[PDB]
């Protein structure tokens, strides 16, 4: 039973997010002339309140729930990865989980009580509920279901990242049965992240042609948070090259990923505030605590 740190990845351009949202409403209404929980006759006031620019600009914070097993590297996040071929769900939830219980609630109570719109995979929904992060309907209030491709190019940030222009990028190897299906990209400290970004950079004509991406969005630096003695830092790149990884879909990445994970854990030294010189082994725990204590994220198990 694996424990993940979910990090709150905030959308910068919430008005663009509102456009995406209403485009999805309109296309789902057209196909069905399973995308969003239907509104009953006397719930028109609720619909008018949600399908409304104010809902996304003033009333609620829009948050992708990014899953990491290396929360100590959050400072170095340069992108946010999503599976472009899969559906993601939008639902209302709480800024604090139970760890900070019955949260069965009417539609109107959820609208009045839940400050955040979360974006996450179907897989995570019940686990989120069970942990007190989202409520259940008196059975999950789904605002929309949107294919990951339509979010590609959106600007995001966290309260931990050094830079605040973390564009959503496509990563088709994200497994939809693991956590939230959204992954912080730390290309300095993770070889699969490096591999994916490097494939996008290298085939930038394919990517900028296929998604709402422009070349100039592909140049974000990732600040390395972890040095291995003898290797130095930017170990994601070091192992990518040492092992001659062919692509981000290379079947040997799975092994490389797990070897690097353990090695960083047992031998790494932190290179960023507030952990400079401390061992990764100790910082992994402090980082989870700080994130959870600052309301920047959650502990998640499934």
PDB file of C-alpha atoms in Angstrom:
ATOM      1  CA  UNK A   1       0.000   0.000   0.000  1.00  0.00           C
ATOM      2  CA  UNK A   2       1.859   3.060  -1.426  1.00  0.00           C
ATOM      3  CA  UNK A   3       1.631   6.602   0.000  1.00  0.00           C
ATOM      4  CA  UNK A   4       1.635   9.475  -2.517  1.00  0.00           C
ATOM      5  CA  UNK A   5       1.966  13.209  -1.920  1.00  0.00           C
ATOM      6  CA  UNK A   6      -0.579  15.120  -3.867  1.00  0.00           C
ATOM      7  CA  UNK A   7       0.511  18.635  -4.715  1.00  0.00           C
ATOM      8  CA  UNK A   8      -1.990  21.424  -5.504  1.00  0.00           C
ATOM      9  CA  UNK A   9      -1.228  22.584  -9.018  1.00  0.00           C
ATOM     10  CA  UNK A  10      -3.079  25.825  -9.578  1.00  0.00           C
ATOM     11  CA  UNK A  11      -4.233  27.062 -12.980  1.00  0.00           C
ATOM     12  CA  UNK A  12      -2.895  30.589 -13.832  1.00  0.00           C
ATOM     13  CA  UNK A  13      -5.304  31.450 -16.622  1.00  0.00           C
ATOM     14  CA  UNK A  14      -8.646  30.516 -15.156  1.00  0.00           C
ATOM     15  CA  UNK A  15     -10.552  32.416 -17.867  1.00  0.00           C
ATOM     16  CA  UNK A  16      -8.900  30.113 -20.472  1.00  0.00           C
ATOM     17  CA  UNK A  17      -9.874  27.198 -18.256  1.00  0.00           C
ATOM     18  CA  UNK A  18     -13.491  28.516 -18.317  1.00  0.00           C
ATOM     19  CA  UNK A  19     -13.449  28.484 -22.135  1.00  0.00           C
ATOM     20  CA  UNK A  20     -12.264  24.868 -22.169  1.00  0.00           C
ATOM     21  CA  UNK A  21     -14.913  23.924 -19.637  1.00  0.00           C
ATOM     22  CA  UNK A  22     -17.829  25.491 -21.663  1.00  0.00           C
ATOM     23  CA  UNK A  23     -16.555  23.988 -24.906  1.00  0.00           C
ATOM     24  CA  UNK A  24     -16.767  20.599 -23.206  1.00  0.00           C
ATOM     25  CA  UNK A  25     -20.285  21.294 -21.897  1.00  0.00           C
ATOM     26  CA  UNK A  26     -21.405  22.235 -25.376  1.00  0.00           C
ATOM     27  CA  UNK A  27     -19.781  19.220 -27.048  1.00  0.00           C
ATOM     28  CA  UNK A  28     -21.224  16.799 -24.479  1.00  0.00           C
ATOM     29  CA  UNK A  29     -24.717  18.367 -24.956  1.00  0.00           C
ATOM     30  CA  UNK A  30     -24.264  17.845 -28.689  1.00  0.00           C
ATOM     31  CA  UNK A  31     -23.155  14.179 -28.481  1.00  0.00           C
ATOM     32  CA  UNK A  32     -26.081  13.340 -26.109  1.00  0.00           C
ATOM     33  CA  UNK A  33     -28.614  15.325 -28.125  1.00  0.00           C
ATOM     34  CA  UNK A  34     -21.635  10.366 -18.397  1.00  0.00           C
ATOM     35  CA  UNK A  35     -19.910  13.808 -18.978  1.00  0.00           C
ATOM     36  CA  UNK A  36     -21.370  15.770 -16.023  1.00  0.00           C
ATOM     37  CA  UNK A  37     -23.900  15.124 -13.285  1.00  0.00           C
ATOM     38  CA  UNK A  38     -27.302  16.267 -14.632  1.00  0.00           C
ATOM     39  CA  UNK A  39     -29.187  19.117 -13.039  1.00  0.00           C
ATOM     40  CA  UNK A  40     -32.740  18.390 -11.769  1.00  0.00           C
ATOM     41  CA  UNK A  41     -35.674  20.812 -12.533  1.00  0.00           C
ATOM     42  CA  UNK A  42     -35.296  23.014  -9.452  1.00  0.00           C
ATOM     43  CA  UNK A  43     -31.485  23.098  -9.718  1.00  0.00           C
ATOM     44  CA  UNK A  44     -31.386  25.785 -12.443  1.00  0.00           C
ATOM     45  CA  UNK A  45     -29.930  28.332 -10.005  1.00  0.00           C
ATOM     46  CA  UNK A  46     -27.060  25.846  -9.359  1.00  0.00           C
ATOM     47  CA  UNK A  47     -26.384  25.377 -13.071  1.00  0.00           C
ATOM     48  CA  UNK A  48     -26.453  29.147 -13.699  1.00  0.00           C
ATOM     49  CA  UNK A  49     -23.958  29.618 -10.833  1.00  0.00           C
ATOM     50  CA  UNK A  50     -21.502  26.937 -12.044  1.00  0.00           C
ATOM     51  CA  UNK A  51     -21.707  27.643 -15.795  1.00  0.00           C
ATOM     52  CA  UNK A  52     -20.588  31.161 -15.160  1.00  0.00           C
ATOM     53  CA  UNK A  53     -17.202  32.870 -15.472  1.00  0.00           C
ATOM     54  CA  UNK A  54     -17.416  33.997 -11.772  1.00  0.00           C
ATOM     55  CA  UNK A  55     -17.442  30.386 -10.665  1.00  0.00           C
ATOM     56  CA  UNK A  56     -13.940  29.872 -12.070  1.00  0.00           C
ATOM     57  CA  UNK A  57     -12.585  33.405 -11.589  1.00  0.00           C
ATOM     58  CA  UNK A  58     -13.949  34.471  -8.186  1.00  0.00           C
ATOM     59  CA  UNK A  59     -15.757  31.684  -6.310  1.00  0.00           C
ATOM     60  CA  UNK A  60     -13.483  28.624  -6.634  1.00  0.00           C
ATOM     61  CA  UNK A  61      -9.788  27.821  -7.098  1.00  0.00           C
ATOM     62  CA  UNK A  62      -9.039  25.493 -10.028  1.00  0.00           C
ATOM     63  CA  UNK A  63      -6.555  22.816  -9.012  1.00  0.00           C
ATOM     64  CA  UNK A  64      -4.936  19.827 -10.788  1.00  0.00           C
ATOM     65  CA  UNK A  65      -3.983  17.197  -8.201  1.00  0.00           C
ATOM     66  CA  UNK A  66      -0.378  16.212  -9.060  1.00  0.00           C
ATOM     67  CA  UNK A  67       0.905  12.965  -7.597  1.00  0.00           C
ATOM     68  CA  UNK A  68       4.600  12.501  -6.559  1.00  0.00           C
ATOM     69  CA  UNK A  69       6.642   9.982  -4.606  1.00  0.00           C
ATOM     70  CA  UNK A  70       9.435  12.595  -4.419  1.00  0.00           C
ATOM     71  CA  UNK A  71       7.890  15.693  -2.798  1.00  0.00           C
ATOM     72  CA  UNK A  72      11.374  16.995  -1.886  1.00  0.00           C
ATOM     73  CA  UNK A  73      11.889  17.823  -5.643  1.00  0.00           C
ATOM     74  CA  UNK A  74       8.805  20.099  -5.932  1.00  0.00           C
ATOM     75  CA  UNK A  75      10.914  23.266  -6.049  1.00  0.00           C
ATOM     76  CA  UNK A  76      12.372  22.066  -9.360  1.00  0.00           C
ATOM     77  CA  UNK A  77       8.996  21.404 -11.155  1.00  0.00           C
ATOM     78  CA  UNK A  78       9.152  22.901 -14.617  1.00  0.00           C
ATOM     79  CA  UNK A  79       6.017  21.324 -16.277  1.00  0.00           C
ATOM     80  CA  UNK A  80       2.887  19.383 -15.426  1.00  0.00           C
ATOM     81  CA  UNK A  81       2.305  16.043 -17.211  1.00  0.00           C
ATOM     82  CA  UNK A  82      -1.124  14.672 -18.135  1.00  0.00           C
ATOM     83  CA  UNK A  83      -2.211  11.767 -20.325  1.00  0.00           C
ATOM     84  CA  UNK A  84      -3.602  13.410 -23.418  1.00  0.00           C
ATOM     85  CA  UNK A  85      -5.580  10.348 -24.541  1.00  0.00           C
ATOM     86  CA  UNK A  86      -7.608   9.917 -21.295  1.00  0.00           C
ATOM     87  CA  UNK A  87     -10.486  11.628 -19.539  1.00  0.00           C
ATOM     88  CA  UNK A  88     -10.100  13.705 -16.463  1.00  0.00           C
ATOM     89  CA  UNK A  89     -12.905  14.608 -14.058  1.00  0.00           C
ATOM     90  CA  UNK A  90     -13.640  17.964 -12.477  1.00  0.00           C
ATOM     91  CA  UNK A  91     -15.163  17.907  -9.042  1.00  0.00           C
ATOM     92  CA  UNK A  92     -15.532  20.114  -5.995  1.00  0.00           C
ATOM     93  CA  UNK A  93     -13.531  19.476  -2.853  1.00  0.00           C
ATOM     94  CA  UNK A  94     -12.036  20.654   0.395  1.00  0.00           C
ATOM     95  CA  UNK A  95      -8.883  22.519   1.097  1.00  0.00           C
ATOM     96  CA  UNK A  96      -8.163  20.150   4.045  1.00  0.00           C
ATOM     97  CA  UNK A  97      -8.550  16.356   4.301  1.00  0.00           C
ATOM     98  CA  UNK A  98      -9.559  14.355   7.416  1.00  0.00           C
ATOM     99  CA  UNK A  99      -5.863  13.884   8.352  1.00  0.00           C
ATOM    100  CA  UNK A 100      -5.641  17.685   9.018  1.00  0.00           C
ATOM    101  CA  UNK A 101     -15.530  10.754   8.128  1.00  0.00           C
ATOM    102  CA  UNK A 102     -18.956  11.240   6.601  1.00  0.00           C
ATOM    103  CA  UNK A 103     -18.979  14.077   4.027  1.00  0.00           C
ATOM    104  CA  UNK A 104     -22.225  13.094   2.330  1.00  0.00           C
ATOM    105  CA  UNK A 105     -23.775  16.330   1.066  1.00  0.00           C
ATOM    106  CA  UNK A 106     -26.460  17.748  -1.229  1.00  0.00           C
ATOM    107  CA  UNK A 107     -25.437  19.448  -4.421  1.00  0.00           C
ATOM    108  CA  UNK A 108     -26.148  22.851  -2.943  1.00  0.00           C
ATOM    109  CA  UNK A 109     -24.099  22.112   0.204  1.00  0.00           C
ATOM    110  CA  UNK A 110     -21.086  21.056  -1.878  1.00  0.00           C
ATOM    111  CA  UNK A 111     -21.391  24.298  -3.923  1.00  0.00           C
ATOM    112  CA  UNK A 112     -21.532  26.326  -0.657  1.00  0.00           C
ATOM    113  CA  UNK A 113     -18.905  24.384   1.282  1.00  0.00           C
ATOM    114  CA  UNK A 114     -16.127  23.323  -1.160  1.00  0.00           C
ATOM    115  CA  UNK A 115     -13.620  25.973  -2.152  1.00  0.00           C
ATOM    116  CA  UNK A 116     -11.667  24.119  -4.828  1.00  0.00           C
ATOM    117  CA  UNK A 117     -12.430  22.561  -8.236  1.00  0.00           C
ATOM    118  CA  UNK A 118     -10.112  19.528  -8.516  1.00  0.00           C
ATOM    119  CA  UNK A 119      -9.050  17.904 -11.656  1.00  0.00           C
ATOM    120  CA  UNK A 120      -8.181  14.240 -11.358  1.00  0.00           C
ATOM    121  CA  UNK A 121      -8.554  10.728 -12.820  1.00  0.00           C
ATOM    122  CA  UNK A 122     -11.609   8.483 -12.306  1.00  0.00           C
ATOM    123  CA  UNK A 123      -9.330   6.079 -10.414  1.00  0.00           C
ATOM    124  CA  UNK A 124      -8.654   8.639  -7.656  1.00  0.00           C
ATOM    125  CA  UNK A 125     -12.242   9.739  -6.975  1.00  0.00           C
ATOM    126  CA  UNK A 126     -13.378   7.250  -4.343  1.00  0.00           C
ATOM    127  CA  UNK A 127      -9.993   7.268  -2.712  1.00  0.00           C
ATOM    128  CA  UNK A 128     -10.164  11.058  -2.448  1.00  0.00           C
ATOM    129  CA  UNK A 129     -13.676  10.828  -0.886  1.00  0.00           C
ATOM    130  CA  UNK A 130     -12.553   8.081   1.560  1.00  0.00           C
ATOM    131  CA  UNK A 131      -9.703  10.365   2.639  1.00  0.00           C
ATOM    132  CA  UNK A 132     -11.920  13.474   3.148  1.00  0.00           C
ATOM    133  CA  UNK A 133     -10.594  15.489   0.219  1.00  0.00           C
ATOM    134  CA  UNK A 134     -13.854  15.423  -1.780  1.00  0.00           C
ATOM    135  CA  UNK A 135     -17.483  14.865  -0.619  1.00  0.00           C
ATOM    136  CA  UNK A 136     -20.069  12.443  -1.910  1.00  0.00           C
ATOM    137  CA  UNK A 137     -23.553  13.287  -3.183  1.00  0.00           C
ATOM    138  CA  UNK A 138     -26.554  12.485  -0.989  1.00  0.00           C
ATOM    139  CA  UNK A 139     -22.710   9.730  -5.816  1.00  0.00           C
ATOM    140  CA  UNK A 140     -19.750  12.001  -6.818  1.00  0.00           C
ATOM    141  CA  UNK A 141     -20.686  15.470  -8.099  1.00  0.00           C
ATOM    142  CA  UNK A 142     -19.022  15.627 -11.505  1.00  0.00           C
ATOM    143  CA  UNK A 143     -18.848  19.066 -13.133  1.00  0.00           C
ATOM    144  CA  UNK A 144     -17.231  17.895 -16.295  1.00  0.00           C
ATOM    145  CA  UNK A 145     -15.173  15.072 -17.820  1.00  0.00           C
ATOM    146  CA  UNK A 146     -12.506  16.378 -20.206  1.00  0.00           C
ATOM    147  CA  UNK A 147      -9.947  14.655 -22.407  1.00  0.00           C
ATOM    148  CA  UNK A 148      -6.324  15.438 -21.277  1.00  0.00           C
ATOM    149  CA  UNK A 149      -5.390  16.818 -24.745  1.00  0.00           C
ATOM    150  CA  UNK A 150      -7.606  19.864 -24.255  1.00  0.00           C
ATOM    151  CA  UNK A 151      -5.599  20.980 -21.167  1.00  0.00           C
ATOM    152  CA  UNK A 152      -2.257  20.713 -22.929  1.00  0.00           C
ATOM    153  CA  UNK A 153      -0.560  24.126 -23.015  1.00  0.00           C
ATOM    154  CA  UNK A 154      -2.410  25.606 -20.027  1.00  0.00           C
ATOM    155  CA  UNK A 155      -0.165  27.452 -17.586  1.00  0.00           C
ATOM    156  CA  UNK A 156       0.007  26.124 -14.002  1.00  0.00           C
ATOM    157  CA  UNK A 157       2.025  26.732 -10.781  1.00  0.00           C
ATOM    158  CA  UNK A 158       2.407  25.527  -7.254  1.00  0.00           C
ATOM    159  CA  UNK A 159       3.269  27.354  -4.087  1.00  0.00           C
ATOM    160  CA  UNK A 160       6.541  25.420  -3.948  1.00  0.00           C
ATOM    161  CA  UNK A 161       7.940  25.786  -7.450  1.00  0.00           C
ATOM    162  CA  UNK A 162      10.750  28.220  -8.231  1.00  0.00           C
ATOM    163  CA  UNK A 163       9.064  29.181 -11.531  1.00  0.00           C
ATOM    164  CA  UNK A 164       5.399  29.797 -11.965  1.00  0.00           C
ATOM    165  CA  UNK A 165       4.843  29.013 -15.734  1.00  0.00           C
ATOM    166  CA  UNK A 166       4.448  25.244 -15.568  1.00  0.00           C
ATOM    167  CA  UNK A 167       2.810  24.363 -18.821  1.00  0.00           C
ATOM    168  CA  UNK A 168       0.754  21.195 -19.063  1.00  0.00           C
ATOM    169  CA  UNK A 169       2.543  18.708 -21.369  1.00  0.00           C
ATOM    170  CA  UNK A 170       1.394  15.325 -22.793  1.00  0.00           C
ATOM    171  CA  UNK A 171       2.798  12.074 -21.321  1.00  0.00           C
ATOM    172  CA  UNK A 172       1.063   9.039 -22.821  1.00  0.00           C
ATOM    173  CA  UNK A 173       2.846   6.582 -20.351  1.00  0.00           C
ATOM    174  CA  UNK A 174       0.908   7.873 -17.300  1.00  0.00           C
ATOM    175  CA  UNK A 175      -1.026   4.855 -15.996  1.00  0.00           C
ATOM    176  CA  UNK A 176      -4.674   5.705 -15.369  1.00  0.00           C
ATOM    177  CA  UNK A 177      -4.957   3.138 -12.559  1.00  0.00           C
ATOM    178  CA  UNK A 178      -2.263   4.851 -10.456  1.00  0.00           C
ATOM    179  CA  UNK A 179      -3.121   7.840  -8.196  1.00  0.00           C
ATOM    180  CA  UNK A 180      -4.601  11.006  -9.877  1.00  0.00           C
ATOM    181  CA  UNK A 181      -2.965  10.591 -13.348  1.00  0.00           C
ATOM    182  CA  UNK A 182      -1.308  13.969 -13.148  1.00  0.00           C
ATOM    183  CA  UNK A 183       2.419  14.172 -12.543  1.00  0.00           C
ATOM    184  CA  UNK A 184       4.713  17.105 -11.679  1.00  0.00           C
ATOM    185  CA  UNK A 185       7.539  17.174 -14.200  1.00  0.00           C
ATOM    186  CA  UNK A 186      10.976  17.584 -12.490  1.00  0.00           C
ATOM    187  CA  UNK A 187      13.236  16.950 -15.478  1.00  0.00           C
ATOM    188  CA  UNK A 188      16.460  17.652 -13.492  1.00  0.00           C
ATOM    189  CA  UNK A 189      15.825  14.899 -10.921  1.00  0.00           C
ATOM    190  CA  UNK A 190      13.801  12.209 -12.764  1.00  0.00           C
ATOM    191  CA  UNK A 191      14.949  10.290 -15.806  1.00  0.00           C
ATOM    192  CA  UNK A 192      11.468   9.539 -17.167  1.00  0.00           C
ATOM    193  CA  UNK A 193      10.548  13.243 -16.859  1.00  0.00           C
ATOM    194  CA  UNK A 194      13.787  14.168 -18.646  1.00  0.00           C
ATOM    195  CA  UNK A 195      12.988  11.558 -21.325  1.00  0.00           C
ATOM    196  CA  UNK A 196       9.533  12.886 -21.985  1.00  0.00           C
ATOM    197  CA  UNK A 197      10.557  16.536 -22.118  1.00  0.00           C
ATOM    198  CA  UNK A 198      13.495  15.617 -24.358  1.00  0.00           C
ATOM    199  CA  UNK A 199      11.207  13.750 -26.790  1.00  0.00           C
ATOM    200  CA  UNK A 200       8.868  16.762 -26.909  1.00  0.00           C
ATOM    201  CA  UNK A 201      11.757  19.166 -27.517  1.00  0.00           C
ATOM    202  CA  UNK A 202      13.269  16.880 -30.173  1.00  0.00           C
ATOM    203  CA  UNK A 203       9.915  16.344 -31.978  1.00  0.00           C
ATOM    204  CA  UNK A 204       8.687  19.873 -31.315  1.00  0.00           C
ATOM    205  CA  UNK A 205       7.213  20.179 -34.806  1.00  0.00           C
ATOM    206  CA  UNK A 206       5.014  17.157 -34.223  1.00  0.00           C
ATOM    207  CA  UNK A 207       4.012  18.397 -30.732  1.00  0.00           C
ATOM    208  CA  UNK A 208       3.399  22.100 -31.531  1.00  0.00           C
ATOM    209  CA  UNK A 209       1.419  21.036 -34.594  1.00  0.00           C
ATOM    210  CA  UNK A 210      -0.742  18.475 -32.743  1.00  0.00           C
ATOM    211  CA  UNK A 211      -1.459  20.333 -29.425  1.00  0.00           C
ATOM    212  CA  UNK A 212      -1.878  23.969 -28.353  1.00  0.00           C
ATOM    213  CA  UNK A 213       1.848  24.350 -27.772  1.00  0.00           C
ATOM    214  CA  UNK A 214       4.452  26.780 -29.065  1.00  0.00           C
ATOM    215  CA  UNK A 215       8.159  26.174 -29.144  1.00  0.00           C
ATOM    216  CA  UNK A 216       8.889  28.939 -26.701  1.00  0.00           C
ATOM    217  CA  UNK A 217       6.872  27.122 -24.004  1.00  0.00           C
ATOM    218  CA  UNK A 218       9.359  24.230 -24.181  1.00  0.00           C
ATOM    219  CA  UNK A 219      12.385  25.984 -22.633  1.00  0.00           C
ATOM    220  CA  UNK A 220      11.627  25.951 -18.857  1.00  0.00           C
ATOM    221  CA  UNK A 221      14.610  25.034 -16.727  1.00  0.00           C
ATOM    222  CA  UNK A 222      14.225  22.506 -13.885  1.00  0.00           C
ATOM    223  CA  UNK A 223      16.299  23.466 -10.758  1.00  0.00           C
ATOM    224  CA  UNK A 224      18.029  20.216  -9.524  1.00  0.00           C
ATOM    225  CA  UNK A 225      17.114  19.488  -5.921  1.00  0.00           C
ATOM    226  CA  UNK A 226      19.288  16.386  -5.353  1.00  0.00           C
ATOM    227  CA  UNK A 227      22.980  15.659  -5.743  1.00  0.00           C
ATOM    228  CA  UNK A 228      24.372  12.118  -5.709  1.00  0.00           C
ATOM    229  CA  UNK A 229      27.986  12.024  -4.514  1.00  0.00           C
ATOM    230  CA  UNK A 230      30.339  11.097  -7.453  1.00  0.00           C
ATOM    231  CA  UNK A 231      27.566  11.952  -9.991  1.00  0.00           C
ATOM    232  CA  UNK A 232      26.670  15.511  -8.942  1.00  0.00           C
ATOM    233  CA  UNK A 233      23.190  16.867  -9.609  1.00  0.00           C
ATOM    234  CA  UNK A 234      20.846  16.655 -12.648  1.00  0.00           C
ATOM    235  CA  UNK A 235      20.852  12.949 -12.128  1.00  0.00           C
ATOM    236  CA  UNK A 236      17.704  12.567 -14.352  1.00  0.00           C
ATOM    237  CA  UNK A 237      19.819  13.634 -17.341  1.00  0.00           C
ATOM    238  CA  UNK A 238      22.890  11.675 -16.139  1.00  0.00           C
ATOM    239  CA  UNK A 239      21.033   8.351 -16.155  1.00  0.00           C
ATOM    240  CA  UNK A 240      19.133   9.133 -19.385  1.00  0.00           C
ATOM    241  CA  UNK A 241      22.504   9.425 -21.159  1.00  0.00           C
ATOM    242  CA  UNK A 242      24.412   6.729 -19.299  1.00  0.00           C
ATOM    243  CA  UNK A 243      21.703   4.204 -20.196  1.00  0.00           C
ATOM    244  CA  UNK A 244      21.123   5.535 -23.731  1.00  0.00           C
ATOM    245  CA  UNK A 245      17.351   5.714 -23.243  1.00  0.00           C
ATOM    246  CA  UNK A 246      15.722   5.701 -26.681  1.00  0.00           C
ATOM    247  CA  UNK A 247      12.460   7.479 -25.899  1.00  0.00           C
ATOM    248  CA  UNK A 248      10.168   8.179 -22.912  1.00  0.00           C
ATOM    249  CA  UNK A 249       8.336   4.916 -23.837  1.00  0.00           C
ATOM    250  CA  UNK A 250      11.516   2.795 -23.561  1.00  0.00           C
ATOM    251  CA  UNK A 251      10.653  -0.328 -21.645  1.00  0.00           C
ATOM    252  CA  UNK A 252      13.926  -0.190 -19.623  1.00  0.00           C
ATOM    253  CA  UNK A 253      12.915   3.193 -18.081  1.00  0.00           C
ATOM    254  CA  UNK A 254      10.774   1.358 -15.491  1.00  0.00           C
ATOM    255  CA  UNK A 255      13.894  -0.243 -13.990  1.00  0.00           C
ATOM    256  CA  UNK A 256      15.957   2.912 -14.311  1.00  0.00           C
ATOM    257  CA  UNK A 257      13.170   4.841 -12.573  1.00  0.00           C
ATOM    258  CA  UNK A 258      13.150   2.489  -9.584  1.00  0.00           C
ATOM    259  CA  UNK A 259      16.965   2.293  -9.267  1.00  0.00           C
ATOM    260  CA  UNK A 260      17.293   6.072  -9.337  1.00  0.00           C
ATOM    261  CA  UNK A 261      14.436   6.410  -6.830  1.00  0.00           C
ATOM    262  CA  UNK A 262      16.248   4.210  -4.261  1.00  0.00           C
ATOM    263  CA  UNK A 263      19.641   5.663  -4.859  1.00  0.00           C
ATOM    264  CA  UNK A 264      18.412   9.240  -4.401  1.00  0.00           C
ATOM    265  CA  UNK A 265      16.516   8.147  -1.309  1.00  0.00           C
ATOM    266  CA  UNK A 266      19.518   6.409   0.371  1.00  0.00           C
ATOM    267  CA  UNK A 267      22.430   8.571  -0.922  1.00  0.00           C
ATOM    268  CA  UNK A 268      21.058  11.926  -2.125  1.00  0.00           C
ATOM    269  CA  UNK A 269      21.897  15.297  -0.687  1.00  0.00           C
ATOM    270  CA  UNK A 270      19.492  18.185  -0.986  1.00  0.00           C
ATOM    271  CA  UNK A 271      20.738  21.235  -2.908  1.00  0.00           C
ATOM    272  CA  UNK A 272      17.776  23.648  -2.417  1.00  0.00           C
ATOM    273  CA  UNK A 273      16.211  25.698   0.378  1.00  0.00           C
ATOM    274  CA  UNK A 274      15.115  24.984   3.014  1.00  0.00           C
ATOM    275  CA  UNK A 275      17.048  21.682   2.931  1.00  0.00           C
ATOM    276  CA  UNK A 276      20.537  22.606   1.661  1.00  0.00           C
ATOM    277  CA  UNK A 277      23.069  19.937   2.767  1.00  0.00           C
ATOM    278  CA  UNK A 278      20.484  17.718   4.466  1.00  0.00           C
ATOM    279  CA  UNK A 279      20.182  14.117   3.371  1.00  0.00           C
ATOM    280  CA  UNK A 280      17.296  13.291   0.931  1.00  0.00           C
ATOM    281  CA  UNK A 281      16.463  10.393   3.233  1.00  0.00           C
ATOM    282  CA  UNK A 282      15.513  12.858   6.023  1.00  0.00           C
ATOM    283  CA  UNK A 283      14.116  15.580   3.682  1.00  0.00           C
ATOM    284  CA  UNK A 284      11.582  13.226   2.063  1.00  0.00           C
ATOM    285  CA  UNK A 285       9.729  13.174   5.415  1.00  0.00           C
ATOM    286  CA  UNK A 286      10.135  16.875   6.235  1.00  0.00           C
ATOM    287  CA  UNK A 287       8.908  17.814   2.761  1.00  0.00           C
ATOM    288  CA  UNK A 288       5.703  15.727   3.088  1.00  0.00           C
ATOM    289  CA  UNK A 289       5.078  17.408   6.449  1.00  0.00           C
ATOM    290  CA  UNK A 290       5.712  20.940   5.271  1.00  0.00           C
ATOM    291  CA  UNK A 291       3.490  20.449   2.206  1.00  0.00           C
ATOM    292  CA  UNK A 292       0.669  19.018   4.277  1.00  0.00           C
ATOM    293  CA  UNK A 293       1.070  21.626   7.050  1.00  0.00           C
ATOM    294  CA  UNK A 294       1.103  24.560   4.592  1.00  0.00           C
ATOM    295  CA  UNK A 295      -2.080  23.286   2.901  1.00  0.00           C
ATOM    296  CA  UNK A 296      -0.032  22.940  -0.313  1.00  0.00           C
ATOM    297  CA  UNK A 297      -1.051  19.263  -0.675  1.00  0.00           C
ATOM    298  CA  UNK A 298      -2.353  16.016   0.740  1.00  0.00           C
ATOM    299  CA  UNK A 299      -1.263  12.498   1.692  1.00  0.00           C
ATOM    300  CA  UNK A 300      -2.954   9.940  -0.580  1.00  0.00           C
ATOM    301  CA  UNK A 301      -3.027   6.077  -0.500  1.00  0.00           C
ATOM    302  CA  UNK A 302      -4.998   3.639  -2.597  1.00  0.00           C
TER     303      UNK A 302
END
